[PDB]
Symmetry: C2
Subunit: 63 residues, 2 copies
Amino acid sequence: MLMITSFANPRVAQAFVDYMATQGVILTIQQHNQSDVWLADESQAERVRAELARFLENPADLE
Amino acid sequence: MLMITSFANPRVAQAFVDYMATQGVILTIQQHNQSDVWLADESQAERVRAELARFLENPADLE
Protein backbone atom coordinates (compact mmCIF):
# COMPACT_ATOMS: atom_id res chain seq x y z
CA MET A 1 0.00 0.00 0.00
CA LEU A 2 1.46 3.32 -1.14
CA MET A 3 -0.10 6.64 -0.14
CA ILE A 4 -1.12 8.36 -3.38
CA THR A 5 -1.85 11.76 -1.84
CA SER A 6 -3.55 13.61 1.02
CA PHE A 7 -6.66 15.75 0.63
CA ALA A 8 -8.83 17.89 2.92
CA ASN A 9 -12.25 17.50 1.30
CA PRO A 10 -14.76 14.74 0.46
CA ARG A 11 -15.77 16.13 -2.94
CA VAL A 12 -12.14 16.07 -4.08
CA ALA A 13 -11.19 12.76 -2.46
CA GLN A 14 -14.25 10.96 -3.82
CA ALA A 15 -13.98 12.69 -7.19
CA PHE A 16 -10.35 11.58 -7.49
CA VAL A 17 -10.92 7.92 -6.62
CA ASP A 18 -14.01 8.15 -8.81
CA TYR A 19 -12.36 9.15 -12.09
CA MET A 20 -9.53 6.78 -11.17
CA ALA A 21 -11.74 3.75 -10.55
CA THR A 22 -13.66 4.31 -13.78
CA GLN A 23 -10.31 4.58 -15.55
CA GLY A 24 -9.22 1.15 -14.37
CA VAL A 25 -7.44 2.26 -11.21
CA ILE A 26 -8.84 1.39 -7.78
CA LEU A 27 -8.12 3.87 -4.98
CA THR A 28 -8.91 4.18 -1.27
CA ILE A 29 -9.85 7.17 0.88
CA GLN A 30 -9.56 7.69 4.63
CA GLN A 31 -11.90 10.28 6.15
CA HIS A 32 -10.76 11.26 9.64
CA ASN A 33 -13.32 11.92 12.39
CA GLN A 34 -12.64 13.61 15.73
CA SER A 35 -14.52 16.16 17.82
CA ASP A 36 -12.20 18.20 20.04
CA VAL A 37 -13.89 20.08 22.88
CA TRP A 38 -12.30 23.38 23.89
CA LEU A 39 -13.47 26.04 26.34
CA ALA A 40 -12.74 29.77 26.44
CA ASP A 41 -13.81 30.46 30.03
CA GLU A 42 -10.96 29.00 32.08
CA SER A 43 -12.90 29.84 35.24
CA GLN A 44 -15.65 27.54 33.95
CA ALA A 45 -13.11 24.95 32.81
CA GLU A 46 -13.36 23.45 36.29
CA ARG A 47 -17.15 23.15 36.24
CA VAL A 48 -17.21 21.58 32.78
CA ARG A 49 -14.36 19.26 33.74
CA ALA A 50 -16.25 17.84 36.72
CA GLU A 51 -19.66 17.64 35.04
CA LEU A 52 -18.05 16.15 31.94
CA ALA A 53 -16.29 13.38 33.86
CA ARG A 54 -19.59 12.70 35.62
CA PHE A 55 -21.39 12.60 32.28
CA LEU A 56 -18.86 10.37 30.51
CA GLU A 57 -19.62 7.63 33.04
CA ASN A 58 -23.30 8.12 32.23
CA PRO A 59 -23.68 6.58 28.74
CA ALA A 60 -27.27 7.45 27.83
CA ASP A 61 -27.58 10.94 26.35
CA LEU A 62 -24.09 11.78 25.07
CA GLU A 63 -24.18 8.43 23.26
CA MET B 1 -8.70 28.75 25.49
CA LEU B 2 -8.35 25.50 27.44
CA MET B 3 -9.08 22.14 25.82
CA ILE B 4 -11.89 20.56 27.84
CA THR B 5 -11.66 17.11 26.27
CA SER B 6 -11.56 15.09 23.05
CA PHE B 7 -14.35 12.98 21.54
CA ALA B 8 -14.70 10.71 18.51
CA ASN B 9 -18.34 11.34 17.62
CA PRO B 10 -20.62 14.26 16.65
CA ARG B 11 -23.60 13.17 18.75
CA VAL B 12 -21.49 13.17 21.92
CA ALA B 13 -19.63 16.38 21.14
CA GLN B 14 -22.81 18.29 20.32
CA ALA B 15 -24.74 16.74 23.21
CA PHE B 16 -21.95 17.72 25.61
CA VAL B 17 -21.67 21.35 24.50
CA ASP B 18 -25.47 21.34 24.45
CA TYR B 19 -26.08 20.53 28.12
CA MET B 20 -23.12 22.77 28.93
CA ALA B 21 -24.42 25.76 26.97
CA THR B 22 -27.91 25.52 28.47
CA GLN B 23 -26.24 25.44 31.88
CA GLY B 24 -24.52 28.76 31.30
CA VAL B 25 -21.26 27.38 29.91
CA ILE B 26 -20.37 27.92 26.25
CA LEU B 27 -18.23 25.23 24.61
CA THR B 28 -16.63 24.69 21.21
CA ILE B 29 -16.21 21.57 19.07
CA GLN B 30 -13.67 20.81 16.34
CA GLN B 31 -14.70 18.16 13.81
CA HIS B 32 -11.49 16.97 12.14
CA ASN B 33 -11.68 16.47 8.37
CA GLN B 34 -8.97 14.79 6.29
CA SER B 35 -9.20 12.48 3.28
CA ASP B 36 -6.07 10.37 2.82
CA VAL B 37 -5.69 8.72 -0.59
CA TRP B 38 -3.84 5.40 -0.62
CA LEU B 39 -3.28 2.88 -3.41
CA ALA B 40 -2.62 -0.86 -3.28
CA ASP B 41 -1.32 -1.30 -6.83
CA GLU B 42 2.23 0.04 -6.55
CA SER B 43 2.66 -0.48 -10.29
CA GLN B 44 -0.27 1.90 -10.79
CA ALA B 45 1.07 4.25 -8.12
CA GLU B 46 3.04 5.88 -10.94
CA ARG B 47 0.28 6.41 -13.51
CA VAL B 48 -1.92 7.69 -10.69
CA ARG B 49 0.75 10.00 -9.28
CA ALA B 50 1.10 11.72 -12.66
CA GLU B 51 -2.60 11.89 -13.55
CA LEU B 52 -3.42 13.02 -10.01
CA ALA B 53 -0.78 15.76 -9.99
CA ARG B 54 -2.19 16.94 -13.32
CA PHE B 55 -5.75 16.86 -11.97
CA LEU B 56 -4.95 18.68 -8.73
CA GLU B 57 -3.78 21.68 -10.75
CA ASN B 58 -7.04 21.43 -12.69
CA PRO B 59 -9.67 22.75 -10.25
CA ALA B 60 -12.94 22.07 -12.08
CA ASP B 61 -14.38 18.67 -11.16
CA LEU B 62 -12.48 17.57 -8.05
CA GLU B 63 -13.61 20.88 -6.54
